[PDB]
Amino acid sequence: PGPPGIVIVEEITESTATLSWSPAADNHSPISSYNLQARSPFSLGWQTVKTVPEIITGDMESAMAVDLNPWVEYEFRVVATNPTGDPSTPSRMIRTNEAVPKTAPTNVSGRSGRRHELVIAWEPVSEEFQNGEGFGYIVAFRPNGTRGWKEKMVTSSEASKFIYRDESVPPLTPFEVKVGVYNNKGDGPFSQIVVICSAEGEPSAAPTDVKATSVSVSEILVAWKHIKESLGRPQGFEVGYWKEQEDTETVKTRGNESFVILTGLEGNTLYHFTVRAYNGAGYGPPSSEVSATT
Numbered sequence: 001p002g003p004p005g006i007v008i009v010e011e012i013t014e015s016t017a018t019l020s021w022s023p024a025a026d027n028h029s030p031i032s033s034y035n036l037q038a039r040s041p042f043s044l045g046w047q048t049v050k051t052v053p054e055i056i057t058g059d060m061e062s063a064m065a066v067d068l069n070p071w072v073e074y075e076f077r078v079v080a081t082n083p084t085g086d087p088s089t090p091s092r093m094i095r096t097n098e099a100v101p102k103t104a105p106t107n108v109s110g111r112s113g114r115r116h117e118l119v120i121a122w123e124p125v126s127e128e129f130q131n132g133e134g135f136g137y138i139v140a141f142r143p144n145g146t147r148g149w150k151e152k153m154v155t156s157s158e159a160s161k162f163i164y165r166d167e168s169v170p171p172l173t174p175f176e177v178k179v180g181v182y183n184n185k186g187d188g189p190f191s192q193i194v195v196i197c198s199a200e201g202e203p204s205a206a207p208t209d210v211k212a213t214s215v216s217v218s219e220i221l222v223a224w225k226h227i228k229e230s231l232g233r234p235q236g237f238e239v240g241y242w243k244e245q246e247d248t249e250t251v252k253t254r255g256n257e258s259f260v261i262l263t264g265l266e267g268n269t270l271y272h273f274t275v276r277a278y279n280g281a282g283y284g285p286p287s288s289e290v291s292a293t294t
Contacts, residue, residue, distance in 0.1 A: 001026055001085035004034075004078045009091050010062070014070045014099045019091060020062030024080035031058035031082050036065050039075045039090075042128045046077065046087070070099035070131035098132030101125075101181040101188030105137065108179050110196030110281065112233075113163060115171050118198040121161040122179050122191070130157060134184035137162075144174040144195055171199035172280050196281070200233060203277035203284030207237065210275050212292040217267035220292055223259035224275055235279045240286070241271050252278075269294050 002025035011018040024031065034056040037046045052064035068074060076091040105122040113119035120139055137154040139162045154162055174197055180190035209225040222239055229235050237253045239260055240246065253260055265271070270293040277284040 001029070001031055001080040001082045003086040004080065004088040007076055007078055007088050007091035009076060009094050011064075012094055012096060014097050015068045016064055016066055017068060017074060017076065017094060017096070018062070018064040019076055019078075021078045021088060023061055024078075024085065024088075026058075026080075026082060027085075029082035031080050033058055033081050034060065034063070035079050035081065036063060037077050037079060037087065038065060038068070039077075040069075040072050040128065042072075042126070068096050069128055070096050070102075071133075072096055072128055098183070098185050100186045101129070101131050101135065101183055103129040103131075104181050104189045104191040105179055106191075108177065108191050108194045108196075109201065110177075110198075111161065111201040113199055114165075115199055116165060116167045116169055118164040118166070118169065118173075118175060119161060119201065120164075120177055120179070120196065121201075124158055124160050125181065130181075130183060131188075132183040132185045134182075136182055138178075138180040138182060138190075140178040140180065140190065141175045143169075144176050146176075149178075169198050171197075173198045200279060200281045202281045203235065203279055206285045206287040207275040207277060208287070210273070210287045210290050212271075212273050212290045214292045214294050215261065217294045218265055219261060219263050220265060220271060220294055221259065221261045222273050222275065222290070224287065226258035227256065227277065229256040233279065235277060237275055237277055238283065240274050240276075243269055243271055246272070246274070265294055267294055 004021040004024045007021045009019045035048045038049045039046045050066040056063045073095045077088045079087040107123040109121050111119040111121045135157040139152045140149045178190045181188035207224040212222040214220040239251050272291045274286045276286040
């Protein structure tokens, strides 16, 4: 089956393009069907798309591509099949119509700041999900257990954080925090409400270099790379040990120490360990699971 000659894009919407094509030369074999294919600037390559109708039969010369994203540039091409040949030269470049944003940012977090600063951060939203011009974020926050929302219009699609300075706020005050989206077509969804402390973000990276080697038969030592402690910002570590599922024992360190010895264990017994950092905002990500046997 040869290649379709031209691909005409006839109608365009928020999430739909409708397109037709002059047929493909069947090589003495009745074309079973056509597949539609699309490519945006964010596509790694061409891909077959959902269509209307669902199957495009051999005698059809037009169909509708579905579930496109608003305000994305698409290019289309068509490929025939008989018991599957070459694809067409691509259609013109179109760009679907603008819509309201539909996709709020992920990873809404607190970061550390100055004593009386509430630092809210998030992962920005890519061009392919802004659904229109004039994309920005909307940060909304309130002391935890308070009704009125303070809000701020962050007007840069590339912004990943926002700072609020209030001296009345003592450090480590929990806020309810929302981050939403908008563009010139209007208002989008808010993220889920996260609760994050003022002044200090949770520890950001796991302990590393976690080694565990046994010491006796009642004892075994676990040690990790030392992390520097800021002044006036206490840190510690929690070490989880088990022999069974992780969900079954913890020990905390003496301030910022980078090792512990575990006593009162059983002899000739294989243990497993993970380590995570804690400060005044909570716990950081747990480390890589290590082990050793008494």
